[PDB]
Design a protein around this ligand. Structure first.
Ligand SMILES: C[C@@H]1O[C@@H](O[C@H]2[C@H](Oc3cc(O)c4c(c3)O[C@H](c3ccc(O)cc3)CC4=O)O[C@H](CO)[C@@H](O)[C@@H]2O)[C@H](O)[C@H](O)[C@H]1O
Ligand SMILES: O=c1ccn([C@@H]2O[C@H](COP(=O)(O)OP(=O)(O)O)[C@@H](O)[C@H]2O)c(=O)[nH]1
Length: 419
């Protein structure tokens, strides 16, 4: 009856959360939880009572495990300079048939070898994995494997291409090109996946195929009901911060600013956003990121490298975000309107979904001005319809619950090896 359940995920701290939440639900039903990842996450995994397995302990000698987190600042700075210079359309034209994240595929060989060895050693009854793309080990190991998805799920539908930030309001003439480019770039992702799968002698699958079951986490009221149903076997899983003294005795609303764990490594991005907010008549709490001591703060601001974001969000009036999925769900669960300044990949889809459903505004780096940021703040704080829309979504998120259904499917698959 007690199952052995093994999780793993990509390097993003965001890619941990769905996995951690699903693991907590299964541990409460008496299952043994294992989580394979990097040492930096041992503390959170062991605090949850899951057994921590270090990917680094299982590397094949000639395929060292690529750890992308420490170098992310270099990659993130290149992405920032493209976003500040180019329109979304120009970004795709300049990409010239290269894909947003296919660059990561070749380097994934070491992690695949490690997971092969980990699943052979620990012999779990089922595995769950939150990746950007399927990996060969998911089709070679002796147990069922559930892909877990936390990125914007438009890629699970037959609609507008993923990673473009297409609007529901874009006419066919306006989008037909950016869409064609996105299609040529899907072929580069397939080509790189074909080389990774060939290396391991595994027949290639679609990058987001769910063989028996896939679990995606996205706000129900934001999901793409207008595109019909997600891909086969995918199911949606619906589940006191102390204010600094510096910001007391000061007028205006309280605003949280975060460009997320990864993009915040780019000090130039936060500096570009903060400078004009010195003149906004409100109070700002800032997640300053790992280089945060290099970031200048003004008299109306307080910040630290890593904020207790979930404790803070109920106390704020507005969330200035990069539009990452974890930040989107946390902000809307707390009932706070968003200004999304997207930085990379699925953040463009989330930013446009916020604008399209009246939950906030999208502000692009390529046409950014201080005047426009300050005006976005005043507009959203005073927009009774946006504040009503956000309140309605937060209520729906508090009520919606698919846990029993999804846990039953995981347990059924773990025991029967079929659904
Ligand atoms: C994995 C990387 O692959 C190449 O590089 C490409 C780069 O590859 C990635 C692959 C990824 O999986 C990610 C990435 C870049 O950056 C993402 C990112 C994260 C945070 C940000 O603020 C901005 C961007 C994170 C991610 O998952 O993609 C660019 C287009 O989006 C291309 O122009 C780059 O040739 C290049 O070989 C890099 O040296 C190598 O580290
Ligand atoms: O200063 C910070 C930055 C991030 N996070 C948490 O780290 C996770 C990932 O945040 P990020 O914005 O990087 O994720 P994304 O929105 O891109 O998915 C979430 O649970 C956030 O609440 C946090 O607590 N404090």
């Amino acid at each position: 009856k007690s199952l052995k359940i093994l999780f793993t995920a990509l390097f993003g701290p965001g890619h941990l959360n769905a996995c951690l939440g699903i693991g907590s639900l299964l541990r409460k039903r008496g299952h043994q939880i294992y989580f394979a990842h990097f040492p930096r996450h041992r503390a959170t995994i062991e605090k949850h009572g899951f057994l921590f397995i270090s990917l680094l302990d299982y590397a094949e000698p000639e395929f060292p495990i690529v750890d992308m987190l420490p170098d992310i600042g270099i990659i993130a700075k290149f992405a920032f300079e493209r976003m500040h210079k180019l329109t979304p359309l120009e970004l795709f034209r300049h990409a010239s048939g290269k894909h947003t994240f296919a660059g990561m595929v070749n380097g994934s060989k070491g992690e695949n070898y490690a997971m092969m060895k980990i699943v052979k050693e620990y012999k779990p009854d089922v595995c769950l994995a939150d990746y950007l793309f399927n990996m060969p080990w998911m089709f070679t190991v002796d147990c069922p494997v559930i892909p877990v998805k936390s990125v914007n799920p438009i890629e699970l539908y037959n609609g507008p291409p993923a990673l473009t930030g297409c609007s529901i309001h874009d006419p066919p003439s306006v989008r037909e090109e950016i869409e064609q480019l996105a299609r040529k770039s899907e072929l580069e992702l397939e080509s790189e996946l074909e080389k990774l799968f060939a290396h391991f002698n595994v027949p290639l699958v679609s990058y987001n195929y769910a063989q028996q079951l896939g679990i995606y986490i996205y706000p129900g009221p934001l999901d793409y009901k207008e595109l019909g149903s997600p891909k086969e076997n995918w199911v949606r899983l619906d589940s006191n911060f102390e204010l600094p003294e510096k910001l007391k005795d000061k007028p205006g609303k309280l605003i949280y600013v975060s460009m997320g764990s990864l993009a915040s490594a780019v000090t130039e991005l936060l500096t570009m956003i903060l400078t004009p907010l010195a003149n906004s008549p409100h109070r700002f709490i800032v997640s300053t990121g790992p280089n945060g001591d290099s970031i200048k703060l003004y008299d109306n601001m307080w910040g630290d490298k890593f904020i207790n974001q979930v404790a803070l969000l109920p106390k704020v009036d507005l969330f200035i975000t990069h539009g990452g999925s974890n930040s989107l769900i946390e902000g809307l669960t707390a009932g706070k309107p968003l200004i999304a300044i997207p930085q990379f990949g699925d953040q463009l889809d989330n930013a446009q979904r916020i604008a399209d459903l009246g939950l906030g505004v999208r502000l692009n780096l390529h046409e950014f001005s201080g005047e426009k940021l300050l005006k976005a703040i005043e507009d959203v704080l005073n927009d009774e319809k946006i504040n009503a829309n956000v309140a309605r979504v937060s209520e729906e998120l508090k009520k919606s619950d698919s846990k029993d259904k999804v846990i039953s499917l995981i347990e059924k698959l773990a025991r029967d090896k079929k659904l």
